[PDB]
Amino acid sequence: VQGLTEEQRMMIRELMDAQMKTFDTTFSHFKNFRLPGVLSREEAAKWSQVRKDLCSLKVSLQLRGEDGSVWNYKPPADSGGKEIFSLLPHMADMSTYMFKGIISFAKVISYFRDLPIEDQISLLKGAAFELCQLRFNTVFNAETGTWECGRLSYCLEDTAGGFQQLLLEPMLKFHYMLKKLQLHEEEYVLMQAISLFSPDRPGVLQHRVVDQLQEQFAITLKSYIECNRPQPAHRFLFLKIMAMLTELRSINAQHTQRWLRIQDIHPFATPLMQELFGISLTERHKILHRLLQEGS
Amino acid sequence: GLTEEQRMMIRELMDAQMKTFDTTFSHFKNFRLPGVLREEAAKWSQVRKDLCSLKVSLQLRGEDGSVWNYKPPADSGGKEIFSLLPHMADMSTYMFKGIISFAKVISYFRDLPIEDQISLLKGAAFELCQLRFNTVFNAETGTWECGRLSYCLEDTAGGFQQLLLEPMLKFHYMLKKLQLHEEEYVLMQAISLFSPDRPGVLQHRVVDQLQEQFAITLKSYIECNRPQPAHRFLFLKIMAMLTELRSINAQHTQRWLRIQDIHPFATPLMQELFGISLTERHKILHRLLQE
């Protein structure tokens, strides 16, 4: 701590405080979510692409009850029909809940609250998926391929190629790679800040304020790693993290294209997802605007 | 072989079974499911013993190929022990209605006074449901395969021998081992249904003679359609299993009453069948039997 500047210690403290106040790790407040029910050449190419997007990210769901009970949902196998979409309604509700936690996270950060509200909208539109993925990595169990979200657990379905086959999916490789770095909470939340305060997000106007903010978060991260991470296992850690943030932005662009594909074929998005991912600003994004004006 | 009347007797029973036993449970729908989320202490502790003996997991196989599975909670002393009662109450009610319809198509049962029809159904409803459930019981997997629904016995520390301590599980394993035919199952159901010594029966002599005729038909069926020496005492084994079923039925009535007192769960039709003018006390059953 003494190795960091006082401004840098306050920056990590506010980011850590914001994370604790806005990250519902146990999903204890995630309720009323939908669940899978009890039960043309061009169009063929479009469906074929979507079938690969959803098959790569195939998971079973486990719903854990406070009483000790466990509901487990194993997805249908792909027969070429719309059974590939059985879990989309649930994943949209759960993603929307995560996005609302990310929005609250940003609202509590002084540096973000001061910015113009159109930039607050533009930065959240550009980073929502990325910060959600960073938070999901902190609950990812790489031994079991499971995101352990308290009452909800999402387990990757076993495939033919095994581990190697799943690593061909950039989203999954990112989670396995990032988990291997064994990052601290402080390093995760600084990653979130660097991603959030990206000057080159579409629609940003205060490119220069955001860029100066981003640089200070990165400098703080580098300083933290130097004052707390001396082992040879952590050599070049800062640069590794920065490289993973660059990979996360590429995965963010890939996700947007997958989302517009799946939305065209089978609309699944909630109103908040459509605002985040579906591009005057405040008027086109009425939910974000409201949430950003509301209190914490 | 069998007398013509004995063959007709079997044909009417088989007809009733075919018309009223939903073997695939395809018409069992809209059922409730476990949710996402000093003296009184003696009543509670006896109830915990009643529910722990028959712990099952629940599997729902979707038409799309998906599978929902429900592992029950462990007993933490709370009301989680009651998590599956609402579902079982719907399953029991669905089965009981099929048993009621079974008796109604049988000529010998219709010709009885309606109050005897009520008393016989109250006495045998649980037994006929268990006999039907045995036909969907997979003894290799300890699972009742009810169409898209499965109930799978949860593993005990003791193993198979600890389950066999529970009288109803032992019953299903023993009865399955006999490998009875459809006709033998339905004749068991008739013998159980036409029991003259059920509480409330008034035409004891008419019911007794009907039971004897069903039992003679079963005894004759076995002698004529099974290898004589190997199945010499099959009929008596079946009778012994019906005697044990009447004892399990008595135990189940007492368990049901205890659990109902602490944690009301029975449907209106179940309350009538289990004691919660005979017609005035059983107006749902009366309506179902008049239609």
Swiss-Prot record, chain A:
Disulfide partners: none
Chain residues that bind hyperforin: S95, Q133, L134, R135, F136, H255
Main location: nucleus
Source taxon at top rank: Eukaryota
One GO cellular component term: chromatin
Domain NR LBD positions: 7-279
Tissue: Expressed in liver, colon and small intestine.
GO molecular function, one term: DNA-binding transcription activator activity, RNA polymerase II-specific
Compartments where found: Nucleus
Subunit structure: Heterodimer with RXR. Interacts with NCOA1. Interacts (via domain NR LBD) with CRY1 and CRY2 in a ligand-dependent manner.
Described purpose of this protein according to its UniProt entry: Nuclear receptor that binds and is activated by variety of endogenous and xenobiotic compounds. Transcription factor that activates the transcription of multiple genes involved in the metabolism and secretion of potentially harmful xenobiotics, drugs and endogenous compounds. Activated by the antibiotic rifampicin and various plant metabolites, such as hyperforin, guggulipid, colupulone, and isoflavones. Response to specific ligands is species-specific. Activated by naturally occurring steroids, such as pregnenolone and progesterone.
Protein name (record): Nuclear receptor subfamily 1 group I member 2
Entire-sequence positions represented here: 140 to 431 of 434
